[PDB]
Design a protein around this ligand. Sequence first.
Ligand SMILES: [Cl-]
Ligand SMILES: [Cl-]
Ligand SMILES: [Cl-]
Ligand SMILES: [Cl-]
Ligand SMILES: [Cl-]
Ligand SMILES: [Cl-]
Lengths: 656, 656, 656
Amino acid sequence: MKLGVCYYPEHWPKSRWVEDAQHMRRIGIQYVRVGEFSWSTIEPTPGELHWEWLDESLDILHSQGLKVILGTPTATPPKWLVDRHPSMLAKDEAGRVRGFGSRRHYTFASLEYREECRRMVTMMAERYGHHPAVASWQTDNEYGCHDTVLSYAEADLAAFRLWLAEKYGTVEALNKAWGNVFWSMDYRSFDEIELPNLTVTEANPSHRLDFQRCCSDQVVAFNKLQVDILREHSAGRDLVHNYMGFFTAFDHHKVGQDLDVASWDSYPLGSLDKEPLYTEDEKHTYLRVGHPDAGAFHHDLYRGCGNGRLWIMEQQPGPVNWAPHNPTPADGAVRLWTWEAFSHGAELVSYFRWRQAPFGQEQMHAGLLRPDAQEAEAAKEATLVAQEVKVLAESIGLDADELMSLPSAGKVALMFDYDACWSLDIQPQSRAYRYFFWCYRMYEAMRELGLSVDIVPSNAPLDMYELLVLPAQAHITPELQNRLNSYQGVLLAGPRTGSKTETYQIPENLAPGPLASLLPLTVERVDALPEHTQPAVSGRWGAGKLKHWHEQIKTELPCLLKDDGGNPVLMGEGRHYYLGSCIDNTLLKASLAKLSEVAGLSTYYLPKGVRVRERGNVIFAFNYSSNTVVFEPQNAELVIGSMCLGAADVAIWKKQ
Amino acid sequence: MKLGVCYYPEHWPKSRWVEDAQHMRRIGIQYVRVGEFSWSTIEPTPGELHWEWLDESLDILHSQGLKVILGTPTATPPKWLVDRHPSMLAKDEAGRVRGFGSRRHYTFASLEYREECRRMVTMMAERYGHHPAVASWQTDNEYGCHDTVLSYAEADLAAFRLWLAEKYGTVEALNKAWGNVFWSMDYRSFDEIELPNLTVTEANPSHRLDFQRCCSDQVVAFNKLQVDILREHSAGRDLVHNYMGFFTAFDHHKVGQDLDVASWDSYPLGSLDKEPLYTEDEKHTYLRVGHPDAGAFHHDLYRGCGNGRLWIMEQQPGPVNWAPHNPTPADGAVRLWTWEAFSHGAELVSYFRWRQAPFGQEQMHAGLLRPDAQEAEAAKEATLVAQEVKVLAESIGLDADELMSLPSAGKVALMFDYDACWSLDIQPQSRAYRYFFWCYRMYEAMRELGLSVDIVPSNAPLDMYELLVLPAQAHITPELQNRLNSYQGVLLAGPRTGSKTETYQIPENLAPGPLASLLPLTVERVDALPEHTQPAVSGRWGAGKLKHWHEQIKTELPCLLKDDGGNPVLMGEGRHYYLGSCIDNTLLKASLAKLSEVAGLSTYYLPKGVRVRERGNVIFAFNYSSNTVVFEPQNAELVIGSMCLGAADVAIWKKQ
Amino acid sequence: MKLGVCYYPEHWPKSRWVEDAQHMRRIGIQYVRVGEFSWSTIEPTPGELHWEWLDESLDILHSQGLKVILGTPTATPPKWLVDRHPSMLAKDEAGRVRGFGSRRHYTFASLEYREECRRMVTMMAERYGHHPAVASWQTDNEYGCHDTVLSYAEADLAAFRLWLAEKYGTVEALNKAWGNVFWSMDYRSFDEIELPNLTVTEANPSHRLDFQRCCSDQVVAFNKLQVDILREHSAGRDLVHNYMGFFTAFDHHKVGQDLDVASWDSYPLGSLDKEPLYTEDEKHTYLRVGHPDAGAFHHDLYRGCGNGRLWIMEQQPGPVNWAPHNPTPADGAVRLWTWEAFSHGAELVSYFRWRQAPFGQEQMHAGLLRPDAQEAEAAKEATLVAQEVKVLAESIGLDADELMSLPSAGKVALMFDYDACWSLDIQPQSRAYRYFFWCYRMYEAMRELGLSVDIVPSNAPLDMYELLVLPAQAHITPELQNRLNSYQGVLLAGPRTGSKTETYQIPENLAPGPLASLLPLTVERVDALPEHTQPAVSGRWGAGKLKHWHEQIKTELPCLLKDDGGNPVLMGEGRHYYLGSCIDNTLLKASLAKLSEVAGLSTYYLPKGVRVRERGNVIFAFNYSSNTVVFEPQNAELVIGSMCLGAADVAIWKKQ
Ligand SMILES: [Cl-]
Ligand SMILES: [Cl-]
Ligand SMILES: [Cl-]
Ligand SMILES: [Cl-]
Ligand SMILES: [Cl-]
Ligand SMILES: [Cl-]
């Protein structure tokens, strides 16, 4: 439970630097990120290097006891470098070059830019890898931001053809896997295969899925080259990357295998206003705090990506610049979001930025300070959180390190698979269906029942979970099916689970494919629905509606929910259940409450806008609504806040 | 009244083939289409040909008594061929190449691809043109699908400049016809003229119209080269093409002149969900059956294009893949659509496909069988229809061939002109006005009055029709005006009739141009309206509103409808009437009922969702609504179904 | 499971009588009611008696094997009798005489009319009490109809003053019990006490409650005088009265103590249209069948009043005359209502009337026949039910008598108390609160969960019930509290339970009064709410809203539901629970499902408009909706109807 800030000493005169560091310390900041956009300062023209600024900045930060997270500057290479390597530039889906003048102007497939990255990261790692200020390295900055994973340039095609040869061996094997007999798509060789953009009409879903996988693998490779250098020259330092909200274009679990920590960038007001996930009512109700699960969903996903280790590298401190509308946060919201992250096991919450810049694209993005260096609202809220974590630590008899080590895992797991996300986005089949939205709405229902949750990859060990939910595990690997067969907890498999092979085909036995041995049923066909037609649901466990996706199923399993035609909606017995339609929020909660009971877990329908999470003996309660509500856990005493939770407020209790 | 199926033996192991054909026979299928996407199977690399698969498949189908429709494979040429002929690829309106990886990757203007088509079609026609299994040939597959008529590549421009020289002779004549004095557009030569895309702002409507005409003519020429080969080498076989719903980019009457049969591809649930024609209420009400006139409109249009001969080459059997939302059809809907087609004179209704494919873009498109070869819903419904046509034939004392020969023509004609469609789409003048929508809504009103209808081209002989409606015959040829002058039935000319010359100019006498001698009036100007302003209408024949298009007219003709300012809306006497505003559904029915009475035809305001059509002494009744309704024709007896028409149900009566 | 009809031989020429009886037999009618409106036929002028018509009618009915229910004619005494006894006439609440010219023109307090009733009932009972046709007697006809229990004439006041002396002994005791120190209401003697109508403003609730009790007791006494005569002179005959839907002005349990059978008069379409209980949506949705619980609620209440024995004396057969709107029933609705009554244990369902009368107030009230003696819709539906009960009896190996003896009791009891109803109607305290409505809505929730229910009086033995619900048991007698203390099932006490003493005062310990020893809580005060303010509810068992009544409670009991202020809504543990607010339908079902689970009973959220009830091994299913829905009970086989329940349809299954 530590605080941090993102800082740009290169944006401010050196006469500010000592004061900045002292002020950071006064607030309770312990970690500071620098360097990720500094390449033009380091090397304004090739071979003429400027390290003095950074040498001095790191010493000043160290002298105040601040631990530094050093960013490699590869997100924003200089124009002289771009001009030397025209093949490094990405092309968008429309076939146009994505040029210099903003950030992230490269394709991950560019071998020329990778060699330039090897040079610069080696230079930096050799100079600073053993500097006593440097505790951690951030590779690059927000891989994929602005939809930069998929690129449609010559370099991307060259990498794709090599990647396909490695996967399939022969083009004959690829043609069989893709079903290229269809529409006479058959290739004579790998070098006949083109990019999947700018086709007359829909490209083969197998083609598009393998393309996504390849592009994701280029992110893995790009990151891995930096990691290898940093392991060699900066032993003992935590290697981290900063991931984003509402972003699925590369496999974050796979990138995470090469790193020590998963960090992410949380801007609850920007995501609420911008994202089509949210309803009009939600955008209005939660304008100044964000949706109650916007941070939570990602804290749990990225704790999984980090193999237990989660940071927030960038936390919203005030209004941002980049959403269509940019409201000021509610008073107390920065405190709210900070404690929120700590309740999900975040080691560190780092704000961004330290001081609002008066120039450039983000001149309207707030910081802890205003552009004139006077304190803004987040400075006082951060100060309060730092005081409150000391109060908490003392109340439960722990030091800072023991506090951070409190357990964070939930006993309910939601399985999120990037490969499934890509498959389902490629052919949603109803335009109202989105894998991410469905996962998020299943998660919201869990959270409205007061459950503490882990979000896990498909290769995760399952033995520590009493309830396991697979919202839409489109392809089930033979190894996952083995883990499911031996799993001793309660399983809910959601619609479209086991509906696709590895190469984007329908399984020979139809959906749910490998799962059918565990859960004997057959999806005969799919009724894929618009928003305006929502069939009625009834049965043993509740009544309500279904929307978007409506599987027509034959089974002998007992039915817990059915439609008016008597067709199975939710079916199962003992410890195994299958859901074939996207049931509404009411029915999601009804079903999860029943399943939780089978699994030996308690549930509680929390008040609207209220959320709870546990870390060992500590209970964290949050109120995202605009009015005071009472939350009183049983057999516990108040440590921070009150039983009457204010609007945008936090209370912390300890079990007796 | 025969059944068919679209089949892909190349998608299934040869061990399935005998069983497939036997199963088809058991259902009552008599015709089978194969081959239109098989070029990569036939010729995977140039000069290495594989006919054995098709040789064997045709023999197996023949041995079960199935008649084969053989498709030329030119819709989907292989990648090796594309790579050899880069000039064959189309460009979209934005100037980007439309690449390989889907289907229909060629421009019709490509002379290089036409020679490759000449080669392959000659090869196929020589091998199979006298095979006893082959009853018919389909040229290509869905000309124009995915907006592939208009293309903006070098080959298209080259063809356009030649086409313009042929039409005009001199560039001086073209400049006069287009009015190129306007905005200094004058060309010194044909080779100065560019494509009409990527201009600063709106291109000359004359330029855009001649471009559409030229592109349409390239479809005619592309098809004609295949027809000439097939006439030579496959005498006696029916030559057919498969047209689409809601598609107007080429002249289907003109392509039809070179063929024996017009077939089309009916997907009522896809078109309902996808097409902006339909209201929100219609999309909801008819979700699982399609709009009551969606098939009907096209059955009548394409019966005209086929000079009496209509097939449905592709009939929806279950949920499809390609619309934004893809619901399952109502139980009985496949039967409904099949009888519907038969009521409009369809010789053959062919489903698609036989077995749902587990791979490729359309893996979620249903068939008569599921991907595991078990029967899906359409198999049972098709079986029932086959039994019901035998019952019908026996009840009226006819054999199968006599049944098919029952008369199909209506005594009401609606004139549809592709050239008018292009003109009116080029400058709709109110964005709420669409030629196709207006034609469809005039047709809907006729159908709600129980009328059996022909849709006819502008060169059709008129003597067999008692009532003739020209919804918006923008240009009237001198030859059409002569036919109108001598026509002895009742004429209704709709708004914008006779408003344009051949070369996109206003006639010298103003609208309605050549029609003014028959119907003396002057359109002084047009009030072109948004949806929110719908002026009131009253008069001799009814009251209601007008929308979208509101002509200000001077006439001495008697007025049957007028606006509140007393301006003529519907005017005429004896057997000739002009309508100057787009009157609402109520007023359309009021007016058509009056006009029908003058023409000696009866009308009946059918219940909501109910439709009727006659073939000689047979009455076909349909219920597209969700509830039971009573339909009882006078002086007739029930043959199939009931007087209480169920939801998505059919009844068939014979006159006494 | 027998059929009956209400018949008026005195309305038809004697030439019809033999035919009427034969026709009744053909339909399957076994019981016939006659005589209850015949006093002017029997005695048109005093002392001149005409029995010949009835002597002959009973013989004709007997000769066809029809069993007769003979009605005493005291509901409609003749004008000559009224003119002789002006003190017999009631006065309404406004002080006006309620005159001759309709029916029910007497006050139950009139001693003069009671002596006239003694005379006539003795005359009838002596003549017909041993007639072999007479199986049963109905006393009077619909006691209380047209709000005739409360009357405000001199006779009512005289009876009230005597009744008060009997209850209290001294006026001093009455003044103490009523709290007449308040507003100087103290009486010096019983003869100072007036009727509670026409006061300046609100009368003492103690005064109004004792007045209701007294008036109810006059109904008991009026009925008891007839019962005593009929016991003496017609031994072995079933004595019955015909009660009504939605009528609470006398104690039906107390009247029932003196009778053998409780019968009632069910007009589902009239009650739906007329009663303010029902919402606008319900009135529209169920127009032609009635609300799904309209009959059910009363079948269960009156089975309790009949100590197990329930008849329907009058069943709607077609449109009635008396509601503001009078629709025709849905086709099959009469069958629906008949089977409905049988599923609740009705021995007999009797229609009304046999033939629609062409004269008088009810000339538009349908019968089994039209006024011209041709069959109407109910004749065919009744015939079908008679055939179906024979099919049922044979399928389960029972004779008619064994069929009738099938068990009927539910394992869930809802306690209905007329005294509580009067108390709560006297001061509802929120105008949106009504005891009857609350009981009905608790019952609806039980029924939507598929539960079979008993409705019981407060003195009922409780040992046969696993779940017991007291919706609002305002006063708890010491004897009821003893029964609750020893009850071994699950108890839910609803809001306002134990809130009043016997004499309309707040208990000394506050609400819930005697229940507080069992359920320790204190109602500190009441928030009595309009419809527009419905506080949010959350907690262990669900989320939703409360309306109308919102008790502010202090308790140490665990809370299963709470409001946003953390105030208890539903509280308890083990087998005892208290509900303090009128929670919505969703929360009622959530709570009843939990309570049912504690009690060892299963629940099922049935489809909308569907209801189920059991009698031993027989399962009765009903569909009150307008569309087909699937109901399939487990471990059972179909006997009558189908798994696909049609609109207004019935299916009957037997357990395997
Ligand atoms: Cl900064
Ligand atoms: Cl991307
Ligand atoms: Cl096929
Ligand atoms: Cl096009
Ligand atoms: Cl009668
Ligand atoms: Cl009353």
